Amino acid sequence: ARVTVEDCLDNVDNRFELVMLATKRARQLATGGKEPKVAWENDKPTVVALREIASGLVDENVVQQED
Amino acid sequence: EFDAIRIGLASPEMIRSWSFGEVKKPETINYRTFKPERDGLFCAKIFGPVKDYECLCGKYKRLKHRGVICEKCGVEVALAKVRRERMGHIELASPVAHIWFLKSLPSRIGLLLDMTLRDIERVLYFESYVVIDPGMTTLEKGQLLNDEQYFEALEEFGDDFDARMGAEAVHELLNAIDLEHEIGRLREEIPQTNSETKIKKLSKRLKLMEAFQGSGNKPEWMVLTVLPVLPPDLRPLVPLDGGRFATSDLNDLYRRVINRNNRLKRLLDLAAPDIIVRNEKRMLQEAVDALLDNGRRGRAITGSNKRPLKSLADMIKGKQGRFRQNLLGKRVDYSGRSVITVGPTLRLHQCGLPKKMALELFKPFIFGKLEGRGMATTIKAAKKMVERELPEVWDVLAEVIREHPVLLNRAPTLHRLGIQAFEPVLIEGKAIQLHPLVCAAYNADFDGDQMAVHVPLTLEAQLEARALMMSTNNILSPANGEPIIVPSQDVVMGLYYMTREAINAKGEGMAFADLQEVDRAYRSGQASLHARVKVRINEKIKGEDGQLTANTRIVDTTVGRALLFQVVPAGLPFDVVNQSMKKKAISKLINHCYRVVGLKDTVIFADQLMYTGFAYSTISGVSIGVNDFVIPDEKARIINAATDEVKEIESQYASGLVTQGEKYNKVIDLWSKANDEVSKAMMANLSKEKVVDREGKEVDQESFNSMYMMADSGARGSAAQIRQLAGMRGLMAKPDGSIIETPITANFREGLNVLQYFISTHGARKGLADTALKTANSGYLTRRLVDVAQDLVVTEIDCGTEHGLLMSPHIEGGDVVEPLGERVLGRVIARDVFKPGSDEVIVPAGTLIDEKWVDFLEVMSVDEVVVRSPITCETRHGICAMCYGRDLARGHRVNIGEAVGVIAAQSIGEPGTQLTAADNVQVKNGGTIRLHNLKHVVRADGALVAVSRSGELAVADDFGRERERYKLPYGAVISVKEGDKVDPGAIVAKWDPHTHPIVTEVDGTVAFVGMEEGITVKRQTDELTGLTNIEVMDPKDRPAAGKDIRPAVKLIDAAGKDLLLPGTDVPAQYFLPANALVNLTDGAKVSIGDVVARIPQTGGLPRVADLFEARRPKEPSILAEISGTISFGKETKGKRRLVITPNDGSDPYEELIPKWRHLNVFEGEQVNRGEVISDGPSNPHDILRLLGVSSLAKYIVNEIQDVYRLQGVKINDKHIETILRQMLRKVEVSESGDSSFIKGDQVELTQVLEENEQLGTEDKFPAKYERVLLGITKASLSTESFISAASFQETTRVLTEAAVTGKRDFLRGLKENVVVGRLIPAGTGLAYHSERKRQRDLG
Ligand SMILES: [Mg+2]
Ligand SMILES: [Zn+2]
Ligand SMILES: [Zn+2]
């Protein structure tokens, strides 16, 4: 249900580059550049951007190609 | 962007470029109208206008041409912020020298002019005449001259002699100083002179002139002809109520230097004589002195003010020492504070927030939702809606606050856990609610404490508070792996009462199907909370990762123990619940749950424990009554028996049998023995007080008393505090340091007397006075440790080194204190681990040791494994992540970018607020005796006496590891039992520390050689034939003839042949020290190893802070320099010099020691440079330059841990060794060849210069270095950036040194970027600096 930023940090195992991919991803949702693949959970843009990292729908090369 | 800031002297051509005009009139405002005029301090012609886009006449006020200039006057139109950048300058008639080059102790002008500090001042004040450009004249430039002396010099010379006096005479020499030729005079005369005070002066001349030319600075830039003025916006005139205004203290200093400059600018054509032309220049020189700095030399005063004028030097420093007021504190927006309040109905990842605070902190966020929805198009209409607090505003306020985390922190912060982000939930009230479990990390109680609040704004900050600063992420402590979210006192008490077992209870012997069926019977009232039942459980084992199996098992537990298993997830077994569940039992439960299941299930498990702990505690009637403090019936028997024994002791004091010096020791030892006798009888009655009856005869169980529950569970209280309520208090301590002979008999329940209560005040007031001082010392200790560990950021991922430190368990003492598994937990391996058998490997490479490898190494007999320490990994600019251990907060490895230097300094200063015989060897265990570093020869009798001072007795267990290692003194008689089992308590040594044993390895007849009667030996015996021996004489009490004579009892064979010991050609001889008693006379046979002669023999914060400053103690231990032969110096010379002569290479150099300290006066023994000679405190300076770097790091961690383990805290060894790496960065050079002789260079800077110079044809361009240990105060100032050295202390000396050197600053540190405004290079800011250097490196 809610965002799980604890287990998502264990997949990449960096906890420092995860917020870098989440910053450029959450900025595209607020400006309206791209539509999120996962359905909206009636939350802010900073929450949906963290759930897409653990699901594997977005990545460093995926977010770079969308811009 | 911008970087590479420079510091240099200003040129006269550059000052005229920043200025926009010239000021010559002190008048700046008018009394008729408060508007500035032309040519003033607040004028609009040079600086900007008083308002935006306005002028003096007021003709042009439009916004079409902002850059246009007015034609009626000189003031142009501009903005209001332009008055902060524009500045002016004054034109001086005579140049004046600054005070920065004369205020510091080494005068920068005198070192370049070969003059003193007083002589350079006598010339500027027109007090003495000097000559310049002599040429063909006998007068020198450095020599002085008077009025009559200069006139006589012109008569004998006639020409080629110009004597000038004033500031122009000094400036005329700097233009023709010939800096290129002045360095050649000192370099050519470098090998000619041989002196200590002249060599140090020569090093400072070459190191400063080289940096003076390499920076592009000019010598004439020291003295300035013009003086820039500060912009008027930094010294404004703000009016207040009543028609009054305020003027800064700087406006008076600028007014004093301007009017005196005009008085000198108008006296250039009036033909002023010499009497006044020398004094009017000093009026201007003292004005610049009062403008730069006050209190040192000038100390200017003003009217109606006792304090001196605030000059430009005192405004940048301010208060709090050398640190600026802006750096120590900066006000921020979107903040607030209130009183805390505990809330049990709050989740762990959220907190509380009042509606009145959420409406003011999130004010800009509400205006963004009202305009986007379409309710208020104008921002003014939305402001009136949020103030009226209508029903629609509360709808959007709860919508904007749903997942936006806020920050919470207490006023004092000592560690990283002080700032934790929380999710705000709207509540009703005026207090900020907090979770009860996170109070252990904040170190705050609900007694009136106020916590701060902060609101992040940007999108980058919202993602930061949800990944690292969240409350669910920082569960483990930064010091040790134990969690800090452990259940607190109240919830543990509720859990301890649940996990209990009663002998007779309601609903015993019944069988339940499952946990759901067992809980149904408890709520119905047919089953007690703690009763022996038989239930069936369903648990899952996670021995294999990725697979979960289920199995049913029927166990014999209680009803309360079965309900607790419903809280723990199915991933854990059942054996972690069947215990008594004390406070230490749950601390090991969360630590085990964190490393088995994960983190997503640990937060839910830690939250469900607080709900089930409080629900089952409110149903309990745990209350402290007067009947709970039971008194044992044996208290009156011990007190009446002890009172009758003291009456027997005091009666003997009046007769004269016992003295007062021994009566004090017997009374404090009698009441102390009676103090433990009451405590043993009190706890034995409180533990078995409850007596239950079942099936006839009664039985005994654990007492369910309210006071015993709070002590057995460990939730609140200690074992020593019970002795003060239901038992006697005992002896108390006086403020002077002594102990009162009579103790306090009564306790708190029976009531204290008027005199007994006055004694307890001495220890209470001293305790309340210490908690007010530790807040200042611990806060000062954490500031010095963090200022030396800021530039240490993990940036590398693979170093490639093969060095490390040997790790061994705490084998010192009777038993083990710290096991091996608790020391290498998380530290990677350095080399290959070898089995007891050869050709075997356990760990192949440097793999990270986890909880799985700890049990794998504990099953084997391995005990000495080498790991990689931060003192190793000599790479520059950070520390690699491989040699660094695992993360303390995260279970995985340390990532790239985490600042391990800050978390290491905070882990030491965090527990600072809590911190304030040897005759025989008796082993406590049994095993094979193994001797190491002990050389003992065989004995003819069989006692195996060893006279060596280096040795240790270690007993090995059945596995092969040394369980206990004791210290063996010199001259100890011990029987070896290698290969035989030893019983517990068996005596292994029977040495005597009262007399120093002296033995000789030579076996034969001994004869004294070089002994004179009446000078060195005295025939003195005891009374009644008590002792008939030969007593030697002292070195100072002997005569002048026997002062240089030293007795030497040589041992040879009985047949007449000279016997010598193997190894050295010098025959073995017996030592004869001063005041020695030899029982065996000369000419008699003596056994090998027998006694030759008879010679009789703080703590706290100041202790832990002494080890980091490398402070030498008052009494330093005396050691040996080079191993070899040990001897005794001449007593007649007054300095005992122990000469050395090794067998490999003879060293004629030796050291001398004074006769004030007497230690190791034995003539003839081994050197043992590693072994100490004089017993006492050891200095860390002598250990580094003698043995190496591995022992100094092992000694610091050992002594520091012995201070923290006394109180009970546990700190990991990674934080103690991290500070040791920064203190060992400076090294000294002996024979450089490529640089100066004595200089301070870094170890990494010398290693890169050594490796690059070795790649040549000569292969000898490199040099040698030596490691030196520096304190934390001296290592902080040894930095390349002047910003880090200016913010620490003494910003005056560091600001002048950077001016004459011209250093270019590279912003690559932590403290350097917080003052400029850029991102820090540590943490998430490393990715920003990686793209900056990549773009800069491309060109
Ligand atoms: Mg408090
Ligand atoms: Zn005008
Ligand atoms: Zn390393």
Molecular structure report:
The structure is cut from a larger assembly and holds chains A (67 residues) and B (1339 residues). Chain A has helices at 5-12, 18-31, 45-55, 60-66. By secondary structure, chain A is an all-alpha fold. Chain A has one domain (6-67): Eukaryotic RPB6 RNA polymerase subunit (Alpha-Beta Complex). In chain A, α1 crosses α3 and α2 (18-31) packs across α3 (45-55). By secondary structure, chain B is α+β, with helices and mostly antiparallel strands. Chain B has 41 helices and 41 strands. In chain B, a hairpin with a 7-residue loop joins β14 (535-541) and β15. The longest helix of chain B is centred in the middle third of the chain and has 28 residues, at 660-687. Chain B is globular and about 120 Å long. Chains A and B meet through α1, α2 and α3 of A and α19 of B. The complex binds magnesium ion and zinc ion (2 copies). The PDB classes it as transcription. The entry lists the keywords Pseudomonas aeruginosa, RNA polymerase, sigmaS, RNAP beta lobe, closed beta lobe, holoenzyme, transcription. The entry is titled "Cryo-EM structure of Pseudomonas aeruginosa RNAP sigmaS holoenzyme complexes".
